[PDB]
Amino acid sequence: ADAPLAKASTITGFGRGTNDVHLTGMSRIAQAVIPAGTGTDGYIVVDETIVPELLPRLGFAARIFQRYAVETLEFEIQPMCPANTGGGYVAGFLPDPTDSDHTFDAIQATRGAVVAKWWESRTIRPQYARALLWTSVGKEQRLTSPGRLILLCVGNNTDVVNVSVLCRWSVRLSVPSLETP
Amino acid sequence: NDVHLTGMSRIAQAVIPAGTGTDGYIVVDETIVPELLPRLGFAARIFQRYAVETLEFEIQPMCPANTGGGYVAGFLPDPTDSDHTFDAIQATRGAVVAKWWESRTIRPQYARALLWTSVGKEQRLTSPGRLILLCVGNNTDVVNVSVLCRWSVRLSVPSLETP
Amino acid sequence: DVHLTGMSRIAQAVIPAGTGTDGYIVVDETIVPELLPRLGFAARIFQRYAVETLEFEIQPMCPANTGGGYVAGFLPDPTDSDHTFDAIQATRGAVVAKWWESRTIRPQYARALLWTSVGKEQRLTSPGRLILLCVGNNTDVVNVSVLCRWSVRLSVPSLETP
Amino acid sequence: NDVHLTGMSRIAQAVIPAGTGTDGYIVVDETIVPELLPRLGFAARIFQRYAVETLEFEIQPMCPANTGGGYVAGFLPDPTDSDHTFDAIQATRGAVVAKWWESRTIRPQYARALLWTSVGKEQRLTSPGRLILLCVGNNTDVVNVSVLCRWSVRLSVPSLETP
Amino acid sequence: ADAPLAKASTITGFGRGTNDVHLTGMSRIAQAVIPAGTGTDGYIVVDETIVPELLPRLGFAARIFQRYAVETLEFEIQPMCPANTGGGYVAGFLPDPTDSDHTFDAIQATRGAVVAKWWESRTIRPQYARALLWTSVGKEQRLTSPGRLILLCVGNNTDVVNVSVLCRWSVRLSVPSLETP
Question: With an 8 Å Cβ cutoff, is C162 touching chain D?
């Protein structure tokens, strides 16, 4: 063949990244310790929203993709103390990522909330939002985090309690990009 | 020529007084080199190249039932010199977590390559990973954990070291 | 993908009388592709070599009135600190003879797949060492000249400039 | 014993300023000896006798499309010292001719005998022909031609030269 | 269609000459005359190599092609004198194009050598090299000529003899070129 002024660019597959992944696992959320005597009713033990940062393997993989949709999400409380404590706790899951629910009556009211003594561990099967959210931060909180975990004591514990809440997540990140945190 | 050993052996043992051991306190962080296993330590002073077939761990802690803290353990197949946290042990396959009176079983995901026994300039060819056992609670009384192993390996290529 | 064979001298040393007591290391050189003169011009082509057979000879040269002796072996650790008698004796394919006696080493190689160029880790570029040390006390001037008998299957073509 | 090499390698490269290179101007005339091919040059320093199985050439010239001269090339299986003209290259089998921006492919007719590598008193036993690339036009701008090769050979009878 | 910077050269069949020819014929090689009395035993009458120059139609057609391979090659001696001569000759064909074989014993020894009186003509069916040679000259002679014809007298002839050797050749020139002699 003959010779033109400029041959066309033969970049064939450009911007054809992967689309759909499924990440699962289990990772803790937070952990605290309470001395004896402290921790009457209504004392907030842990209140941390489920942003993708607190799940550590997801937060290194949501810096690629744009949108995620939580398929299954369950929680395990696991306090650690012998059976001579005798206080208690209440655990729940509130799908508002707002900043004012600190009472026993709000947490007991939600779907799939548990209450037990400090020597017993329970399991939360919550009522999550099942929508399709965003990953990066913005002005509005209701599009980037599917709720909060609130755990607070209900009695007056005798010895030192030691709770360590966990999280069993599964998610379907999609729409590839890359941001800067 | 070619052998097939089994065994069961102490890796390490540590003791923790009361007050010590908040979350993230490393109790034992040691690589799986042949110098730590006792019966393989005498047998890898003979041969040169081994390849692990099956390898499993048990934690076996020993404390009264009024302790009320806990531990986490795992197996990281990077034998680097920097993973001291909870979240690196969270990610791995075959990790365990329980209270201080309870024994659990680590079923790891090893490399199944073919390694060396002696030391060298590169670390990745002489040890198929690390065991990390770190306390997650804040214990009440003195515990005494004693981690075990269960190793099966197929040593070959005869030589003799001078350590 | 080729297959090369040949035979090549590795090294040579001469030892006067009195010098060369027991444990005096006569020669110690790794099996790097630079030392074999036909393979040194053929490792400059390809990238990966995997040895099939590798045998040695010792062929020392002295009159029959010297009466010392030697020991020879093959260590598949290309490390940089091995100066002893016991590790050479206990390997597979080790020999012991007099300085006018010639033997033949049939060692236990690695049969892995290595790299030709030099690098930071020595365990992927040279599948062994050859250590030779005296065991008696020499009387006359000896002259050792070790050999090699290699066979290898170079592949994945390139061109280095060492 | 017996090998079979392939490859692809630069034979030669020349540069021509403007004004130079009328018809019949020899750009490159070099015999196909093992000293010119790079990868075979290291491999024919080992063995003694080779025999070419397939051997092809490409011209690959590099100039802007405003040059407007041209070249001719060929392959003469006499490795003599006198063929410097257009008409000897005309006769041969597998010759090419194009303008300076166009690459063409020489598919020659070689000897398929069994040759030697080193030098000798007779020239016909050590090189299976010559490549001749000579300009046929009278070019406008600076060209830069870079002829390639594509050799496949079956070296045998091991030795070692001292060049 | 549209107009580029330069249209490609449409030289289609370039360097596609003829490949295989078969030339035959008959042509003399050399001719001599011997006076009476001269020509004892061992006197060389004719010793000329079979280079393609001495065959005249082949030498004008081997200046094109590179390589030739002699398929059939026979010789005829044809002396010319009456039956009152009474000497003799010996003819042969030596596939060395060297330069030292001058005796009766070397010529009689080869395959297809003849010996007869001067009034009788014979025919040589020789043992040629049947290889594939070159046409142009070079340093080594053994690749460019398939042997020599040597004819020498064996008796002491009485009258003037007159021999005229010939050559029936057939050849398959190939691999086209053109040289300068």
Answer: no
